[PDB]
Design a protein around this ligand. Structure first.
Ligand SMILES: CC(=O)O[C@H]1C(=O)[C@@]2(C)[C@H]([C@H](OC(=O)c3ccccc3)[C@]3(O)C[C@H](OC(=O)[C@H](O)[C@@H](NC(=O)c4ccccc4)c4ccccc4)C(C)=C1C3(C)C)[C@]1(OC(C)=O)CO[C@@H]1C[C@@H]2O
Ligand SMILES: Nc1nc2c(ncn2[C@@H]2O[C@H](COP(=O)(O)OP(=O)(O)OP(=O)(O)O)[C@@H](O)[C@H]2O)c(=O)[nH]1
Ligand SMILES: Nc1ncnc2c1ncn2[C@@H]1O[C@H](COP(=O)(O)OP(=O)(O)NP(=O)(O)O)[C@@H](O)[C@H]1O
Ligand SMILES: Nc1nc2c(ncn2[C@@H]2O[C@H](COP(=O)(O)OP(=O)(O)O)[C@@H](O)[C@H]2O)c(=O)[nH]1
Ligand SMILES: [Mg+2]
Lengths: 451, 433, 385
C-alpha cells in the first residue's frame, strides 16, 4: 500500500537498524521468529502492516530492509542473534577487508565488488512493492563505508529511480569528542553527495544525546544502545502517520513540501520532547503545552548547536496519543509571542501540524517512561551552519600540510577532488547566510505617489 | 576472513613466538596436543585467523620458524608446546651468522631464503583473503636482523598490497650483551624504514624497569619480558577475532596512526598491572586504565614521551564499558596535557572497544603511541655508530663477506634524515622565521 | 645555492582532427596572466579561473596577435635557463599534460623541423653556441643518459638488454645515482634525436579509455655538461660541471576515467603518489625562495624532504642547491574534456600559486549613459567656469 525500504550501511547503520526493528516488532506484535500469534487470537486483521513488513503464505512476515557492510563481524552478530529467523538470509556482506576509515576504499576500490548485488536486491524488493513512498538510508559520516558506499549507492539510486524520495538519518561528527583522526576529510568528501542527491537529511550528534541522557534520564554511563533507542523513537514518530489512524495525517511528501523552502537547504534538526525517567514520570503533568515548550528549549536539541543564534525558517510538529487540536493551537499561539524564538520575515505561517492516535510504546528493559502524549518536532533553521563552520576549520588545519593524504590518493582520487569539495561546502555556507537575512527594507525601492 | 601469517627469526624471535603461541592457545582453548577443549562458543568463530584445520578436529598454527643454528629449534620442540607446530615449517641451517650482519643478509642467509620463501608462499596461497604478515626479531644480532630484513624485502616485493608488521627489540642505552651492536642496528633500520608499514619498538631496559618497579618482581627472567610483549601482541589484533562496539583492524590503525609514510615507529603499552597482593587496594575502572596507560613509566620503548610531542595515539579497550566514559577520558587527557600534543592535528586519539576481555581481567587496554621522542633512540645509536666507524673498529669482519664501505655510509645518512624529519614536527610553535 | 625561482606556464593547443570533426566548443579564455574555463553542463553559476606566471595562446594557428610562437616560449624559458646552465648550475624542465592537451608538442615540435619545441632549440643553441665559441684554451664535453621511473623502479632505455630493475645508491659527495646506468657521448643534435627515438621506443605504454597510448611511467633525459680550461700554466683543471634534466611526467589518473582493474589501477595509484610528492617538494622550494626575500629572516632550512619518492630522490641536485625550475602544462580545448582540463589547471595552480580573480563589465547602455552624463557635467562646468 504505502511501502518504504530501509537501507542500513556501516556499523552505525546496522546497529540503529537493530534498535529500529526491535521497536517495530514490539509495536506491531510480531514475535522475533516472524510469527504473529496475536492475529490468530484475534482471528483476522491488518496488523501485518505493509509499510515495513511483507507477508507470505504461511503467515511469516519478513521486513523490508537491506543491511550492508564490509566487516563480517557486525552482521554475523545478527545472523546468530535473537532475530536470526526474522530477516531474509540475503544480508549482503563483503567477506573481505573493510574500507578502513578511507572514503576512497569505499567509493572507488573495495566499494565495487558489492554494489551490483546490493542494487539487484533493492530492485527485487522495490518490485515487490505496489506503490512506493520513498527510501530511508541510515549511515554515519566519518566512517569509510558509511561515506563512500553511501555516496555510490545514492548516485546509482538517483539514476535508476529518480523521482522517489530519499531521506537520511546520519551521525555528524561532534565538536569536541570523536573516535577517529581522519574524520573531517570523510565528512567533507561526503557533503557533495549528501547535497546533490538526497531530498531531506536529518543530522544528530552523539555528544548532544549523551548530555540529554545525563540530564533527563539520569544515566551517568550510557552506551550506544540508549542513543540508538532514542533515534529509533524519532524515526517511528516520523513514519507513524503512514501506519496508524489519526485526525490529521502527514505523508512523507508533505514533510518535503512544507519543510524545505529551496532545494539546497534541506537540513533540518529533530527533537523529542518527553524524554523522562520512570521515577520522574510522576511529579509532573506532561501536558501538551509543556512538551511543546520543551521542544524549543536549546538544551534539548539533538545537535550541538544553539537555535538562539539564528532564525527558524520552518517547523513541523507530529503529535502522538491523547492530544486534542485546541491545546495544540493554544501552544502554538503561546510560542509565537516569545521574542527569544525568531522567524524569518518571509514565512509568516511557519508551522505544520500532524496528530496521531497511537501512543508511543515501551521497550522492555528500556529507560523511557510510559507516557500518554508525545511530540516530535522537525525544524528547518539557520543555526546549523555554525556546526559546519567548526568542522570546516578542522579540515583546513590538516590540509595545509597534506597530512594523511597519501592513503587517499593511493586508492584512486586526484588531490583535486579534496578542494573541488571544500569549495562546494563554502558555497553552501554562503546560501544559509543569504537566506536568513531579513528582506531589504521596503524591498521594492520606494513607493508613495499620486493615485 | 582476515588471515595473518606469522614469521619469527633468531633466538629472540623464536622465544617470543613460543610464548605468544602459548598465550593465544590459552585464549582460544587449544590443548598442547592441538584439540579444542574450551567452554565458550565465540572461541571457534574466528579461529581461522591464526590456525588451520587438520583432519580430526585438530588445529595447527601458521608459524614459520627460521634460524641458522639448530639449538633453538631443538629447545622449542622439546617444550610444553613443541608438538603443536607443523614439522615442515622448521627451516634451519648450520654454522650460524654469529652476530655478523653480512653473514646473515649477503652470504649464509642467501641459501636458506629460497626455502623459507617457498614455505611462506605455500602457507600464504592457502588463505582465503590474506590481510598481512608479522615478524618477531631483534636488531642487535646477526641472524635476526639480517634474515628478517631480507625476508621483509622479498615479501614486500612479492605481495605489495598487504600490511607488514614487525616487533623489534632495539638495542638498549646501558645494558649491552653484544659489542658490535650499533652496526647491526644501523645497517638494519636502513631497511625497516623502507619496507615496513608499522614497527613497534621494544627495549629490554623498559621491560626490566616495569618488572622491578611496577610488578615488584625480585628475579625477573626472559619469560616475563616475553609475557609482557606477548600480551601486547595479542591485544593489538583483538578486533579481528572477537565482536565489539567499535572495531579497528590493522589497516585502520595503519591509516589513523601514520601521517607520512616514513613515520611509523610506535611505542606500545598495556594496562593494567596490579603486581599481585595489591589487587584488593586498586579499584579497576576505565579512568584508572587511562591513568596508568598514559604514564611515562609504563612504556616499553625506553623513551620519555615528555621530551617530545605525541603525533598520534591509539587506545584499544577490551571489556564491557560505557562509551561516554571512554570519550570523556580521552578528551580530558588531550586537554590537560595540551603541551604534549601537536597543534595541527585537531584530534589525535583513535579509540576502539572490544567485548571479550582476557582470561581473568574484567577489563584491559592496550596503547599504541606515535611521538617524536623515539628519535632519541636513533640519535643514541648514531652517537655510538660513528664513534666506532671513524677508526674502523670491527669493519674487516664485514668487508670479508662482500660489503663495500659505501653501504655503511648510505645508511648513517638515512637514519640521520629520519631523526631530522621527526625533529621538524617537535617544536611547539613555528612562526617568525 | 640560489633562489628557487620557479616559473609556472600553461599553453592551449588548437583542435585535432577528431575534435574538428565533432561540433566542439572552446572553453578556455585567457587575459593577461589569467585563464578561465566553463562547464557545458553547468553554464549558469560561473566560470572557474586560475592565474599563472605565463599563459600561452597557441589555439589559432594563423593568428598574428598574441600568438604564443615556439620561438617566443623558447625566449621566455630556454634561453635564460641555458644561460644559467653555462654559469655551471643545474637546470630542470618538467613537462606535464594529459593525452591530447599537447605535451610532446611543446617538448619536441612538429616533424617538418620548421617550428621547434624546447628540446631542439635548447640543444642547437648549446651545440651551435659552443661550436662558434670553443678555442685552443678550452675544452667542452657533453654526454646524455635516459632512464624511466615505473612503479618506483628505475629502468634503462638506451641499453637494449633484458629490462631488469637497477639499484639507486648515494655517493657521499656526489649525491644520489644509479648503478649500471648507460651513459653515452654526443656530437650534434642528430645523435640526440637518434638516442631519444631509440629510448622512446622502449618506454612502457598501455591503452585506456582516454587514449590507446598513455604514458605509464615518468622519464628523465639527463644532459651532462662539462667545461675544462687550459690556463697558461701546467695545472689543467675542470672549471665546473652542470646538468640539464628534461623530464616527462605521466598525467594524473582517476578510476572515474580509467576503469581498468588489476595492474592498471596500481600504476595509476603509484603515479598519483609520485605526483603528490613532487608538488609537495616544489611548493616548499618556492616558499623557501619567498620567505627571506620578504622578511630577510630565512626560515631556518625548512629541511625539504626528498627521500619520500624515487623521482624527487634522484633529482635532488636539480630541484635544490643552486638551480632553477620551470614547468609547462598543456591544456586541451574540447568542451567535452572538461574535468581533465580542470584537474590539469588545479595541479598547475600549485608551485607559487598566483592570485586570480574575475572582472565582469556592465550593460553597454548604462556605460554610454554614464559617459554622456560625465560629458554633460564637464560642459556644465565648461559653462560654470
Ligand atoms: C587479577 C588476576 O586475576 O591476576 C592477574 C594479575 O594479577 C595481573 C597483575 C597480571 C599478571 O601478569 C603478570 O604477573 C605478568 C608477569 C610478567 C609479564 C607480564 C605480566 C598475571 O600473571 C596475568 C594474568 O592475565 C591473563 O591471564 C590475561 O588473559 C593475559 N594472558 C596471560 O597472562 C597469559 C600468559 C601466558 C599464557 C596464557 C595467558 C592476556 C592479557 C591481554 C591479552 C591477552 C592475554 C592475570 C589475569 C593475572 C596474573 C595471573 C597474576 C598482569 O598481566 C596480564 C597480562 O594480565 C600484569 O599486568 C596485568 C595486571 C593483572 O592484574
Ligand atoms: N549514534 C551511534 N553512532 C555510532 C554507533 N556506532 C558507530 N557510531 C559512529 O560511527 C562512527 C564510525 O563510523 P562507522 O560508519 O561506524 O565506520 P564503519 O561502518 O565500520 O565503516 P569504516 O569506517 O570503513 O570501518 C563513529 O565516529 C561513531 O561515532 C552507534 O551505535 N550509535
Ligand atoms: N600549442 C600547440 N600548438 C599547436 N599544435 C599543438 C600545440 N600543442 C599540441 N599541439 C599538437 O596537437 C597534438 C596534441 O599533442 P599530443 O601529442 O596529443 O600531446 P599529449 O598527448 O597531450 N601528451 P601527454 O600529455 O604526455 O600524454 C599534437 O599533434 C601536437 O603536435
Ligand atoms: N626481549 C628479549 N630479548 C632477548 C631475548 N633473548 C635475547 N634477547 C636480546 O637479543 C640480543 C641478541 O640477539 P640474538 O637473539 O642473539 O639475535 P640472533 O642471534 O640473530 O637470533 C641481546 O642483546 C638480547 O637483549 C629474550 O628472550 N627476550
Ligand atoms: Mg567500517
Amino acid at each position: 500500500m504505502r511501502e518504504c525500504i530501509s537501507i542500513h550501511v556501516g556499523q552505525a547503520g546496522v546497529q540503529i537498524g537493530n534498535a529500529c526493528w526491535e521497536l517495530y516488532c514490539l509495536e506491531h506484535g510480531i514475535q522475533p521468529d516472524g510469527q504473529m500469534p496475536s492475529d490468530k487470537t484475534i482471528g483476522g486483521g491488518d496488523d501485518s502492516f505493509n509499510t515495513f513488513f511483507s507477508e507470505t503464505g504461511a503467515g511469516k512476515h519478513v521486513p523490508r530492509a537491506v543491511f550492508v557492510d564490509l566487516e563480517p563481524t557486525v552482521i554475523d552478530e545478527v545472523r546468530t542473534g535473537t532475530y536470526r529467523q526474522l530477516f531474509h538470509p540475503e544480508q549482503l556482506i563483503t567477506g573481505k577487508e573493510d574500507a578502513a576509515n578511507n572514503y576512497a576504499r569505499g567509493h572507488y576500490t573495495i566499494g565495487k565488488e558489492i554494489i551490483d548485488l546490493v542494487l539487484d536486491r533493492i530492485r527485487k524488493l522495490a518490485d515487490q512493492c505496489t506503490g512506493l513512498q520513498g527510501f530511508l538510508v541510515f549511515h554515519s559520516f566519518g566512517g569509510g563505508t558509511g561515506s563512500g558506499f553511501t555516496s555510490l549507492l545514492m548516485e546509482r539510486l538517483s539514476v535508476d529511480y529518480g523521482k522517489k524520495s530519499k531521506l537520511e538519518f546520519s551521525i555528524y561528527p561532534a565538536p569536541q569528542v570523536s573516535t577517529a583522526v581522519v574524520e573531517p576529510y570523510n565528512s567533507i568528501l561526503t557533503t557533495h553527495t549528501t547535497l546533490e542527491h538526497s531530498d531531506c537529511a536529518f543530522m544528530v550528534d552523539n555528544e548532544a544525546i549523551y548530555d540529554i541522557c545525563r540530564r533527563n534520564l539520569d544515566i551517568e554511563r550510557p552506551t550506544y544502545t540508549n542513543l540508538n533507542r532514542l533515534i529509533s523513537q524519532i524515526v517511528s514518530s516520523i513514519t507513524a502517520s503512514l501506519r496508524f489512524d489519526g485526525a490529521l495525517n502527514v505523508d512523507l511528501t508533505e514533510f518535503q513540501t512544507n519543510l524545505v523552502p529551496y532545494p539546497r537547504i534541506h537540513f533540518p534538526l529533530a527533537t523529542y520532547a518527553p524524554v523522562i525517567s520512570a521515577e520522574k514520570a510522576y511529579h509532573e503533568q506532561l501536558s501538551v503545552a509543556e512538551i511543546t515548550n520543551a521542544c524549543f528549549e536549546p538544551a534539548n536539541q539533538m545537535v550541538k548547536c544553539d537555535p538562539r543564534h539564528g532564525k527558524y525558517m520552518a517547523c513541523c510538529l507530529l503529535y502522538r496519543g491523547d492530544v486534542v487540536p485546541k491545546d495544540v493551537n493554544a501552544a502554538i499561539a503561546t510560542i509565537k509571542t516569545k521574542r527569544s524564538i525568531q522567524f524569518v520575515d518571509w514565512c509568516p505561517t511557519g508551522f505544520k501540524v500532524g496528530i496521531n492516535y497511537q501512543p508511543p510504546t515501551v521497550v522492555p528493559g528500556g529507560d523511557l517512561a510510559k507516557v500518554q502524549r508525545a511530540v516530535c518536532m522537525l525544524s528547518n533553521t539557520t543555526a546549523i551552519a555554525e556546526a559546519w563552520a567548526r568542522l570546516d576549520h578542522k579540515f583546513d588545519l590538516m590540509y595545509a600540510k597534506r597530512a594523511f593524504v597519501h592513503w587517499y590518493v593511493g586508492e584512486g582520487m586526484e588531490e583535486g577532488e579534496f578542494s573541488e569539495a571544500r569549495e562546494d561546502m563554502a558555497a553552501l555556507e554562503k546560501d544559509y547566510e543569504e537566506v536568513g537575512v531579513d528582506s531589504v527594507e521596503g524591498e521594492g525601492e520606494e513607493e508613495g505617489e499620486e493615485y | 576472513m582476515r588471515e595473518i601469517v606469522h614469521i619469527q627469526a633468531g633466538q629472540c624471535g623464536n622465544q617470543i613466538g613460543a610464548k605468544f603461541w602459548e598465550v593465544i592457545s590459552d585464549e582460544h582453548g587449544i590443548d598442547p596436543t592441538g584439540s579444542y577443549h574450551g567452554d565458550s562458543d565465540l572461541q571457534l568463530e574466528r579461529i581461522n585467523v591464526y590456525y588451520n584445520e587438520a583432519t580430526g578436529n585438530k588445529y595447527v598454527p601458521r608459524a614459520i620458524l627460521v634460524d641458522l643454528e639448530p639449538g633453538t629449534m631443538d629447545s622449542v620442540r622439546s617444550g610444553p608446546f613443541g608438538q603443536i607446530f607443523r614439522p615442515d615449517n622448521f627451516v634451519f641451517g648450520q654454522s650460524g651468522a654469529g652476530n655478523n650482519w653480512a653473514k646473515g643478509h649477503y652470504t649464509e642467509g642467501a641459501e636458506l631464503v629460497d626455502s623459507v620463501l617457498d614455505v611462506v608462499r605455500k602457507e600464504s596461497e592457502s588463505c582465503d583473503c590474506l590481510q598481512g604478515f608479522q615478524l618477531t626479531h631483534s636488531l642487535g644480532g646477526g641472524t635476526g636482523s639480517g634474515m628478517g630484513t631480507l625476508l621483509i624485502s622479498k615479501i614486500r616485493e612479492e605481495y605489495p598490497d598487504r600490511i607488514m608488521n614487525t616487533f623489534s627489540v632495539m638495542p638498549s642505552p646501558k645494558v649491552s650483551d653484544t659489542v658490535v651492536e650499533p652496526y647491526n642496528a644501523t645497517l638494519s633500520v636502513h631497511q625497516l624504514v623502507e619496507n615496513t608499514d608499522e614497527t613497534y619498538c621494544i627495549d629490554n631496559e623498559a621491560l626490566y624497569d616495569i618488572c622491578f618497579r611496577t610488578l615488584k618482581l625480585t628475579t625477573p627472567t626472559y619469560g616475563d619480558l616475553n609475557h609482557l610483549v606477548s600480551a601486547t601482541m595479542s591485544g593489538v589484533t583483538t578486533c579481528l577475532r572477537f565482536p565489539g562496539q567499535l572495531n579497528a583492524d590493522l589497516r585502520k590503525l595503519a591509516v589513523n596512526m601514520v601521517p607520512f609514510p616514513r613515520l611509523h615507529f610506535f611505542m606500545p603499552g598495556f594496562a593494567p598491572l596490579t603486581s599481585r597482593g595489591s589487587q584488593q587496594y586498586r579499584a579497576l575502572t576505565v579512568p584508572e586504565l587511562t591513568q596508568q596507560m598514559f604514564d611515562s613509566k609504563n612504556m616499553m620503548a625506553a623513551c620519555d614521551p615528555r621530551h617530545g610531542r605525541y603525533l598520534t595515539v591509539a587506545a584499544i579497550f577490551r571489556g564491557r564499558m560505557s562509551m561516554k566514559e571512554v570519550d570523556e577520558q580521552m578528551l580530558n587527557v588531550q586537554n590537560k596535557n595540551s603541551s604534549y600534543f601537536v597543534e595541527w592535528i585537531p584530534n589525535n586519539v583513535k579509540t576502539a572497544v572490544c567485548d571479550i576481555p582476557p582470561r581473568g581481567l574484567k577489563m584491559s587496554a592496550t596503547f599504541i603511541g606515535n611521538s617524536t621522542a623515539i628519535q632519541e633512540l636513533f640519535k643514541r645509536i648514531s652517537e655510538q655508530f660513528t664513534a666506532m666507524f671513524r677508526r674502523k673498529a670491527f669493519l674487516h669482519w664485514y668487508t670479508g663477506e662482500g660489503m663495500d664501505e659505501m653501504e655503511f655510509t648510505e645508511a648513517e645518512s638515512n637514519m640521520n634524515d629520519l631523526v631530522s624529519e621527526y625533529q621538524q614536527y617537535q617544536d611547539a610553535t613555528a612562526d617568525e622565521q | 645555492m640560489a633562489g628557487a625561482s620557479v616559473k609556472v606556464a600553461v599553453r592551449v593547443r588548437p583542435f585535432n582532427s577528431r575534435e574538428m570533426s565533432r561540433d566542439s566548443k572552446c572553453i578556455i579564455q585567457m587575459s593577461g596572466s589569467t585563464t578561465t574555463i566553463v562547464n557545458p553542463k553547468q553554464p549558469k553559476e560561473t566560470p572557474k579561473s586560475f592565474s599563472f606566471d605565463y599563459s600561452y595562446w597557441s589555439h589559432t594557428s594563423p593568428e598574428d596577435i598574441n600568438y604564443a610562437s615556439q620561438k617566443q616560449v623558447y625566449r621566455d624559458i630556454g634561453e635564460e635557463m641555458l644561460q644559467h646552465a653555462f654559469e655551471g648550475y643545474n637546470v630542470c624542465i618538467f613537462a606535464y599534460g594529459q593525452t591530447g592537451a599537447g605535451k610532446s608538442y611543446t617538448m619536441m615540435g612538429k616533424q617538418e623541423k620548421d617550428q621547434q619545441g624546447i628540446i631542439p632549440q635548447l640543444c642547437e643553441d648549446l651545440f651551435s653556441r659552443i661550436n662558434d665559441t670553443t678555442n685552443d684554451n678550452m675544452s667542452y664535453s657533453v654526454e646524455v643518459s635516459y632512464m624511466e621511473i615505473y612503479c618506483e623502479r628505475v629502468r634503462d632505455l638506451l641499453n637494449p638488454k633484458n629490462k631488469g630493475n637497477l639499484r639507486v645508491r648515494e655517493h657521499p659527495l656526489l649525491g644520489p645515482y644509479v648503478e649500471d646506468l648507460s651513459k653515452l657521448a654526443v656530437t650534434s643534435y642528430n645523435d640526440i634525436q637518434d638516442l631519444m627515438d631509440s629510448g622512446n621506443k622502449a618506454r612502457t605504454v598501455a591503452a585506456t579509455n582516454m587514449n590507446e597510448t598513455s604514458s605509464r611511467s615518468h622519464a628523465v633525459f639527463n644532459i651532462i655538461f662539462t667545461q675544462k680550461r687550459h690556463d697558461a700554466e701546467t695545472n689543467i683543471t675542470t672549471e665546473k660541471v652542470s646538468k640539464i634534466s628534461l623530464v616527462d611526467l605521466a598525467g594524473s589518473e582517476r578510476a572515474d576515467s580509467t576503469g581498468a582493474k588489476g595492474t592498471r589501477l596500481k600504476e595509476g595509484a603509484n603515479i598519483n603518489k609520485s605526483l603528490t610528492t613532487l608538488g609537495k617538494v616544489i611548493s616548499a622550494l618556492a616558499e623557501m625562495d619567498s620567505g627571506p626575500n620578504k622578511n630577510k629572516k630565512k626560515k631556518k632550512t625548512d629541511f625539504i624532504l626528498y627521500r619520500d619518492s624515487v623521482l624527487t630522490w634522484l633529482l635532488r641536485e636539480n630541484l635544490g642547491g643552486n638551480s632553477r625550475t620551470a614547468m609547462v602544462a598543456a591544456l586541451s580545448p574540447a568542451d567535452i574534456n572538461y574535468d581533465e582540463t580542470l584537474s590539469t589547471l588545479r595541479y598547475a595552480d600549485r608551485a607559487k600559486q598566483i592570485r586570480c580573480n574575475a572582472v565582469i563589465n556592465e550593460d553597454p547602455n548604462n556605460k554610454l549613459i554614464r559617459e554622456l552624463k560625465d560629458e554633460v557635467t564637464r560642459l556644465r562646468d565648461l559653462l560654470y567656469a
